[model samples]
Target: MHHHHHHKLKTEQGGAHFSVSSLAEGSVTSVGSVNPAENFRVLVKQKKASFEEASNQLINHIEQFLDTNETPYFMKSIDCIRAFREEAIKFSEEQRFNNFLKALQEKVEIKQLNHFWEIVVQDGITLITKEEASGSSVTAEEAKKFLAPKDK
Candidate 1:
């Protein structure tokens, strides 16, 4: 079984902007051995005609991804999260942010460069436990006390 996550980022010199898209939360499903193909869809509605038109770029990208892969994307969740964060930072340049966020506001509903995070947590059973593996970690409270400052 596998799960998939998606992030969409946009960067421009004049109008810098960032947008995030992901599979709907809780929509992950397992790919049974007997059934391999899995299908999913994402629907985005934009206010302006231009924005709406531009959204096709995103749709096409996602479609291409799904078209090639079937079954839940089990192991790639962590890599996906890292990619989204890095993309957001790269897209935060000055020119592109100003152009994409503000001008479209008057023409459209909102003008914002939104960055979102998506995750597909897979592996391990719903209910499982393990015995302590000696002492390898400390709780938050314990760490706080261990590093407590000395005061008069």
Candidate 2:
């Protein structure tokens, strides 16, 4: 895989700008300001897998991984088992969401997992809208270069 260039973006409320590389977790993370009084997050990319491709790959690969119970590599800890199960369930939900999206193509746009998690975690019942919608797709190194803290 080719490396993407890293960039430091503008500084924010709590801290100096972060390296762009850190933000590109395949999802959307960005450097945006919040109200000065409240804490804000520098936007970042969290996991940007193609809906169908990622869901298929994640479920298929992880399911296979989870099935190999006979080898030493299998998850031995109960916590690990629980975590894996949770992820599997989440993947199933994601797959279901994919189906929902296919059924209503123009009616919805499903994107990053982190954003989805954020709303769901906070009890925000509404399905996600778009994020800091930018236009380009870049490699990891480029992301790193694009989002880092920069000199004023």
User: What are the TM-scores, per candidate, against the unseen true structure?
Assistant: 0.19, 0.20
Candidate 2's TM-score: 0.20
lDDT of 2 by residue, 9-114 (tens): 7555876776776544665752233221111101111244443444334333333443444433222221222232234343433333333223222221343233
**Candidate 1 backbone overlaps, count:** 9
Evaluated at residue 90, the lDDT of candidate 2 is: 38
> What do the candidate models score in CA lDDT, each in turn?
0.27, 0.31
User: Candidate 1's C-alpha lDDT?
Assistant: 0.27
lDDT of 1 by residue, 5-87 (tens): 55546545766568554444455643322211111111112233232223333323333333444324222322322222223
Candidate 2 regions exceeding 4 Å error are 1-49, 70-95, 98-152
Top candidate on lDDT is 2
Cα RMSD (Å) between model 2 and the true structure?
23.2
